[PDB]
């Protein structure tokens, strides 16, 4: 989402979260 | 007698002495001697190389004993005796140790290295003794010496004579490759040497010793003839390269110094003379090219290097080329080059002295080191502290040592600035380190927090702003280094602590991101409240609200990323189920 | 972060297998088809359970920490835990 | 047939020398 | 279907961290497979193939960080068989501003010419580094203003900063600990050139670093290691990087520049010192290089040993600096040294006089490197600022060079020799070169020249024994 | 001939184990004691039967050549062939 408020473990967790959301849609 | 009696004498006088001055004087000598005395009680145990080093050690120690002035000077008649008994204790030791070998045909490097330890002890110790007494201690006007060493001078030269000649004997039997003629000559060499175990000096046998060495050289003269044929062939095989040909003549030199072989090789020596004469024409063209083509200190270094090259060429020629007639023309023409080089070196050193001494009043080169020169400056345009200064100070220390190493005396004005420049250079290198720390810590904040740190950065930079208003003393500069280190530590401590509270709030935000919200909502809200009060404990550490706004804006975005996701899956949980 | 690290491994010299597995024996990440991903996940889960059992029969006071498995066609590599494990596969070296 | 044990040990020592040197060397479990 | 256990297993930050760690382990195993397998042949020529040999490989300058930086260092490990380490200037212009403020080190394999295996970046000008005395863990470095600094080649790949340069991804490893943090003023007040791994005979780990000033003041350090550290960083010991493993602790002070001086003065009279090397047979024996043409001798915990100074063959002083030392790695107590005069010496530790000395070879110019080949025990490589390289071989001849190469039109800035297999292990005397034009360029020697015949190490003891 | 190779393998850096076992399931001598040798030879033989199946179960046209187990105490190495398999144990490094 936002480039000013970056933080790797949080942002990258949100990438895992989005992969769970997409896995749920696939499943 | 033996050196231990001197040390015992200073032990007695230091304890007993009928006035405090005598006790202290004797103790002062007793301590200097005590270093060498411990080694002299041990002398028979020592290995030869430690005895070689002991010559240098005692050279210094006894030169201090003689020269020190804070008490009545050391007794001269006893000094002569002391030097003689040291020579006696060395002689006894050298005789005992060198006597111990199977002094025929042992594996030569051992025999050579033991022989060289003895020879060099004697050569040095004779050289050193007349240097210390006759040069140094005559020239010491606080207490001039009265003489030139009798045991050392005579017996040291005897030891040189025998040990060199025995070194030559062993090296000669080494030069011989295997054939039946070696067996015949080697047995013939041993036989006249028998009974004449030579390390024990005896002047009643010295004539018989000389006579025996004449028999040895007679047997060897047919051997020298045979050796020279193979040696001259090898020296002709390498003949195209002057570099390699010279290096062959350097290593063979004690074999070549045998006067018979010197005459056998004579055309190879005459062609070496021609080669090295032409090399000196090349060196003269090279030196002319250095006049055609700091730059002056590099010139001084190169012409000193060329004096040492021609001096070597002349010293190599002094044994090797002399006894040729042609060598006289080489010797004078090489001496001319050496003298022209000495002249040009002095010209360049005096001209360098003009460059530096005219620089003592003019800041354009950088030598007038002063408080208006910016050691420290801040790039707020970079986020960095920077530290740089006149390269001329590094060039000053480099050139002032280098000339002193070649052989010059530095003018006292140049010495006194170079003292200060040494201290200044040391501390400028520490200020680089501390600034290179303050540059590195900038990377180690995370972006959103950085306004909280603004106060710590400005405090560290306030130490620049008050100080600019310190070369003035190395003490003050050491304190300035310590002040910047203290402030850099204060910042680094504050940053590292705050970065852990930030990482802690990351942990709580991922712990909340982990949770399907609907069935956990009250526990999720409690964890968000715990996070908000956690942030408030950071505010409790001191900070004013404005910095906390920048940080809490970033945090509100982080928790929004988590909440927004858990909402999106909470909506699909109506579609999918 | 983690996806880029799996992409980093996917790109290496002679490498292609990446499978992340749960202690129910079922996979969670892949650069491979789900049927083959599950063949490797189920087989490695059986094999980890016998490996940990074997280490505890060898020495009950010890425990398992890594497994590596080299075959004429490829080498398989396994990083176990109580809840989770990683499988990777590479050409020989 | 001890020569088969010796031939096995020639093949296996060539690998095992390489692999034990690697496992001696490696950072992989620091 | 997707199961209810998938959500806690994929989501958990501990299980995310388990993929960070497990893939960090996987990455280094795949690198180490490339270190086991790979060949020299990946490039055959891009460059002038030089007089020594037939074949060449470049360390490609098209990597944009290297595209405008000149080179000057090369360092090698004896015990890590195949790591080459290179060092790079600032660009005057034209790349990423973050890197432009910084100096670059690159750590390479002779069999990985595609790029650096790791890239390290630094807050100072560098000119010393050495790789670990065992198990290749760390790179140690010394700098133009006395920082002693350490890189850990293991640390994830993402605690350190990174950039995607053009299409491709690179990371620029900030150093894991620096001396600069230390609060009490005990670090080097000087420029450095020695950074020596003192091999061992104070917990978790132990081996030693010895680093040396131009000034003649020595420090010795131990390497000591946290079990794990908070990602926010150490809060007690500030000199460490965020999350770092390794720190250096200080345990010596030797005033070498005062102590063995040929003294006439206090402030420039003290000897400038140019090196340390520690004897591989026994790390308690070290020798030191000087601007006075002496090589000085020393021991660590005992007070006195002899001979005290290795001398020139000529009497008095022969004042031209010594500019490199090396001990034959085969472990005889013998070493090569050579002056900025062009003069060379070869010594045995048990004699103050050279067992050989030479002068006449490199046209009296500055020699700027002397090294003993780790492949042939007798064979030594010398290099001059006239861009000449020469091999000498003490079993063949000691008159001068056995072979000579003059490079042109490129000048030579740096040259280094490659590491130590056994000959049946495929020993490999490769030279790494750098041009004033700034490319790094590897030339491999013919295996007949590089690999020894029978008993050459003993045959060299027999030379020193017959002489 | 053979026992000299056993001393060569015993000599290795940080190592203290050797066991050879035959394809019929019988151990050869060790630098370890007979109780330990029985326990290791039998347990690892069962584990290698599962291992060689597992690689063949991934591909029947493949076969297995080396194995590693790392554990909290130490690392263990395994190397099988037609008539014999080897166990080696290496202390932490």
Author numbering:
A (entry chain E): 313 to 339
B (entry chain A): 170 to 317, 321 to 465, 480 to 655, 664 to 771
C (entry chain G), F (entry chain H): 3 to 95
D (entry chain D): 104 to 133
E (entry chain C): 574 to 774, 792 to 1057
What are the paper's exact sentences on this?
Dynein-2 is a large multiprotein complex that powers retrograde intraflagellar transport (IFT) of cargoes within cilia/flagella, but the molecular mechanism underlying this function is still emerging. Distinctively, dynein-2 contains two identical force-generating heavy chains that interact with two different intermediate chains (WDR34 and WDR60). Dynein-2 is the essential motor for retrograde intraflagellar transport (IFT), the conserved process in which polymeric IFT “trains” translocate cargoes along the ciliary microtubules. A 3.9 Å resolution structure shows how WDR34 and WDR60 use surprisingly different interactions to engage equivalent sites of the two heavy chains.
WDR34 and WDR60 both contain a C-terminal β-propeller domain, with 22% sequence identity. Each β-propeller has seven radially arranged blades, the seventh of which is distorted in WDR60 giving the propeller a more elliptical appearance (top row). Conversely, the equivalent interaction is lacking in WDR60: the loop from bundle 3 of DYNC2H1 is disordered and the residues of WDR60 around the mouth of the pore are poorly conserved. Instead, WDR60 uses a conserved insert within blade 3 of its β-propeller to contact bundle 4 of DYNC2H1. This WDR60 insert, which is absent in WDR34, stabilizes the bundle 3/4 junction of DYNC2H1 in a “straight” conformation. Our cryo-EM structures show that the WDR60 β-propeller is distorted relative to WDR34 and uses a unique insert in its third blade to stabilize DYNC2H1 in a straight confirmation. The only notable shared interaction that WDR34 and WDR60 use to engage DYNC2H1 involves E355 (WDR34)/D881 (WDR60) contacting R587 of DYNC2H1. DYNC2H1 mutation R587C is associated with severe short-rib thoracic dysplasia. N-terminal to the DYNLT1-DYNLT2B binding site, WDR60 contains a further 470 amino acids that are not resolved in the cryo-EM map, suggestive of high flexibility, but whose functions we investigate below using cell biology. In summary, WDR34 and WDR60 use strikingly different interactions to engage the two copies of DYNC2H1 and stabilize them in different conformations.
